[PDB]
Structure formats: C-alpha cells, structure tokens
Design an enzyme around this catalytic site. Structure first.
Site, PDB file in Angstrom:
ATOM      1  N   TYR A  35       0.023  20.420  -3.778  1.00  0.00           N
ATOM      2  CA  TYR A  35       0.249  19.730  -2.514  1.00  0.00           C
ATOM      3  C   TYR A  35       0.060  20.642  -1.305  1.00  0.00           C
ATOM      4  O   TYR A  35       0.936  20.721  -0.446  1.00  0.00           O
ATOM      5  CB  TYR A  35       1.668  19.163  -2.479  1.00  0.00           C
ATOM      6  N   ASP A  42       1.734  20.686   8.169  1.00  0.00           N
ATOM      7  CA  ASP A  42       1.535  19.607   7.198  1.00  0.00           C
ATOM      8  C   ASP A  42       0.903  20.127   5.915  1.00  0.00           C
ATOM      9  O   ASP A  42      -0.032  19.528   5.367  1.00  0.00           O
ATOM     10  CB  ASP A  42       0.647  18.534   7.832  1.00  0.00           C
ATOM     11  N   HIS A  91       0.858   3.813  -3.012  1.00  0.00           N
ATOM     12  CA  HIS A  91       0.560   5.186  -2.594  1.00  0.00           C
ATOM     13  C   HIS A  91       1.552   6.142  -3.279  1.00  0.00           C
ATOM     14  O   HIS A  91       1.145   7.091  -3.933  1.00  0.00           O
ATOM     15  CB  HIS A  91       0.629   5.288  -1.066  1.00  0.00           C
ATOM     16  N   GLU A  92       2.853   5.884  -3.164  1.00  0.00           N
ATOM     17  CA  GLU A  92       3.821   6.800  -3.738  1.00  0.00           C
ATOM     18  C   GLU A  92       3.736   6.868  -5.272  1.00  0.00           C
ATOM     19  O   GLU A  92       3.827   7.941  -5.851  1.00  0.00           O
ATOM     20  CB  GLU A  92       5.245   6.451  -3.314  1.00  0.00           C
ATOM     21  N   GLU A 102      -3.451  13.341  -1.440  1.00  0.00           N
ATOM     22  CA  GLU A 102      -3.070  12.242  -0.531  1.00  0.00           C
ATOM     23  C   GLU A 102      -4.133  11.146  -0.398  1.00  0.00           C
ATOM     24  O   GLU A 102      -3.793   9.978  -0.264  1.00  0.00           O
ATOM     25  CB  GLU A 102      -2.699  12.768   0.868  1.00  0.00           C
ATOM     26  N   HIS A 142      -2.103  15.420   5.001  1.00  0.00           N
ATOM     27  CA  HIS A 142      -2.188  14.050   5.502  1.00  0.00           C
ATOM     28  C   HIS A 142      -3.256  13.899   6.599  1.00  0.00           C
ATOM     29  O   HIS A 142      -3.525  12.793   7.050  1.00  0.00           O
ATOM     30  CB  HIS A 142      -0.836  13.554   6.048  1.00  0.00           C
ATOM     31  N   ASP A 188       0.841  -1.207   0.000  1.00  0.00           N
ATOM     32  CA  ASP A 188       0.000   0.000   0.000  1.00  0.00           C
ATOM     33  C   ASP A 188       0.883   1.268   0.000  1.00  0.00           C
ATOM     34  O   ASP A 188       0.507   2.291  -0.587  1.00  0.00           O
ATOM     35  CB  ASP A 188      -1.058   0.030   1.127  1.00  0.00           C
ATOM     36  N   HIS A 194       1.090   9.051  -6.616  1.00  0.00           N
ATOM     37  CA  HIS A 194       1.445  10.485  -6.692  1.00  0.00           C
ATOM     38  C   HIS A 194       1.982  10.826  -8.090  1.00  0.00           C
ATOM     39  O   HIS A 194       1.737  11.908  -8.594  1.00  0.00           O
ATOM     40  CB  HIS A 194       2.504  10.884  -5.662  1.00  0.00           C
TER      41      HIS A 194
HETATM   42 CA   LIG Z   1      -3.104  -1.769   4.065  1.00  0.00          CA
HETATM   43 ZN   LIG Z   2       1.447  10.761  -0.112  1.00  0.00          ZN
END
Ligand SMILES: [Ca+2]
Ligand SMILES: [Zn+2]
Ligand SMILES: [Ca+2]
Ligand SMILES: [Ca+2]
Ligand SMILES: [Ca+2]
Length: 316
Positions: A157, A226, A142-143, A166, A231, A138, A146
């Site tokens: 962002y 942040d 996820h990365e 995100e 996030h 995951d 992006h």
């Molecule tokens: Ca997971």
């Molecule tokens: Zn991220």
C-alpha cells in the site's frame, strides 16, 4: 451464532427498501448463512473498538434510521459476494468461502471506510461531506476488493503498487455497481458524497482530472503524502481501465472499447495470476497484455485495445 435462517426487511441509507438474510435465535441477527461461511454485520456503537456486537434486532424489521447503514453494509456485502462467485468463480475473498465481517457506526463523524486486514469498517460520515459510507455499493465493493487483492497479488500500500491496489478496488467497485444495475456510472462514491451537492463524486474514472487527479503518467504525483499518492495516481490506471472498456481518444491516442465484461476478465486474471506485491505500472501493463493474450489470443482486438489504452495514459 446458531439459529434458524430467515429473511427480514429494512430500509437502507438512501431510503430504499430491501430484504436481507438474517438468523433467528431469540433475537434476529444480521448473519446471512446463505453465502459461504456467512456474512456478519456488527454495531461498533460509535466507538473505535472492533468488531463491536453482532447486530441484534427484536422483530426482524430494520426501518429505524440507526439501522440503515447496517442494512446496506449487510446487503451490499452479499451482492459483492455474488458478483465474485457468479462472474469469476471465486468463493469469497480468500477463495475458500471465508466469512465476511463488517462493522458500522464506527467512531463519531468518521468520513471514511476501510478494510483493516480482517474486516470492513464504515463510518457514518459527518452529514455534510459524507453520509453513512455503506450506502454506496461502489464503496462496499471497493473495500471488499482490498480483501481480494491482499489474498492474491498482495500489492503493498505505497507508491505505484499501492496506486494499483486502489485502482483495482475502484475498477471492481464500479463493475459490481454495474452488476447490480443501481444507476451505474464510472464515478466513485457519488451516492454518499456531499449530500448537499448534486452531480459530484469522490473520484472519476472517466475523467480523473475533473477532481485534480492525474490522467496521464507524465502527471503522476511523486511526493510523500497519501503513501506516495495511492489515491491520486490511481487515476492513471482508472482512466486506462475506462478506455479499455468504453473506448475513446485520449491525448491523441485512440482506443477501441471492448466492454465491461472483458475488462473484468482481463483485470481479474492479471490480479490473480501475474501481479505481485511490488508490481509497478509498467508491470501492470505487461500483466494485462499477457492476460488478454491468454484469454483472446495475441492478435486479438482485445490485446490491441489493452496496449492502446496504456499507450494513451503514457504507461510503457
Ligand atoms: Ca459509482
Ligand atoms: Zn481503497
Ligand atoms: Ca427492528
Ligand atoms: Ca451510481
Ligand atoms: Ca454530492
């Protein structure tokens, strides 16, 4: 490098054995020629200089503990490529088969991973908060998501558009986790977070409030830390996505689930067709409704559930 495609074997961060696509030319390199213009994995050798050295191995066996994060970064990049191609007819992150590059062993005790605009980068963790971050599928997905977002909607962002950026990464990271069927769940990072503590994770999509993240728009974070909460406020969108897929009653609003496959199709369309760099939550709602309308018709259950889900998290 130029050489002969072959297949090696190694062990990943969690100690599971897997086959990986390598390339042979004097050494065996972590270069997978079977996917688009290639997947390339590099050793950053505990420095912050990128990309580092293309990973070279003498015998095509990757069972050393130093090898583990590279094995998983390389393998899970392949799985993520396969997901986008097989499920969404998308060829790599740019849609024209761009090479996917990852560096591991970034810095010392680095408790994060990221896409830097050109490649993915994975820390090893400090051994108590995280173990090497590429051990989580995951996290890898996820990365790399992006990268997909940067080439399509281009969501900035910061503030609401960054929170959407995100959430999209958490949503597709989760859908890739389900695609690979590796103990899938609706939590983020559970495989590499706090090796000392069982049952936890970095964020939860099913119940963001579990870790103090908002699950309703009335609870959004409005300060400056942040990047304006990218996030943190993602929890509001993550909860909506969880409701659209799985259904449930949330703050008294009931949502009939339409499952994971349709969730992915609706969000991928929203992302690639309707979102723009400055889209906010209200605009995501409209994009998601229009996407479901395009795909299933304006009077479908699918459109109804998208609307109910966003009503439930307070996004009008
Ligand atoms: Ca997971
Ligand atoms: Zn991220
Ligand atoms: Ca070896
Ligand atoms: Ca899992
Ligand atoms: Ca843990």
């Amino acid at each position: 490098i130029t050489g002969t495609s072959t297949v090696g074997v190694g062990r990943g961060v969690l100690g599971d054995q897997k086959n990986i696509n390598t390339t042979y030319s004097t050494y065996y390199y972590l270069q997978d020629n079977t996917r688009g213009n290639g997947i390339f994995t590099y050793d950053a050798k505990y420095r912050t200089t990128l990309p580092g050295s293309l990973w070279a191995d003498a015998d095509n066996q990757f069972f050393a503990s130093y090898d583990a994060p590279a094995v998983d970064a390389h393998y899970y990049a392949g799985v993520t490529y396969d997901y986008y191609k097989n499920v969404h007819n998308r060829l790599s992150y740019d849609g024209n088969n761009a090479a996917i590059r990852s560096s591991v062993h970034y810095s010392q005790g680095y408790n994060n991973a990221f896409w830097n605009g050109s490649q993915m980068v994975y820390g090893d963790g400090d051994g108590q908060t995280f173990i090497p971050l590429s051990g989580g599928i995951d996290v890898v997905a996820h990365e790399l998501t992006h990268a997909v977002t940067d080439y399509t909607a281009g969501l900035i962002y910061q503030n609401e558009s960054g929170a959407i950026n995100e959430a999209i990464s958490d949503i597709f990271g989760t859908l890739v986790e389900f695609y690979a069927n590796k103990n899938p769940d609706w939590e983020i990072g559970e495989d590499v977070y706090t090796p000392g503590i069982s049952g936890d994770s970095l964020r939860s999509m099913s119940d963001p409030a579990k870790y103090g993240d908002p699950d309703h728009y009335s609870k959004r974070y409005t300060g400056t830390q942040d990047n304006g909460g990218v996030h943190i406020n993602s929890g509001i969108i993550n909860k909506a996505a969880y409701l659209i897929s799985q259904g449930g009653t949330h703050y008294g609003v009931s949502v009939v689930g339409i499952g994971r496959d349709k969730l992915g199709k609706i969000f991928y369309r929203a992302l690639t067709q309707y979102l723009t760099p400055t889209s906010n939550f209200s605009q995501l709602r409209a994009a998601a409704v229009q996407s479901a309308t395009d795909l299933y018709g304006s009077t479908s259950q699918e459109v109804a559930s998208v609307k109910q889900a966003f009503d439930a998290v307070g996004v009008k």
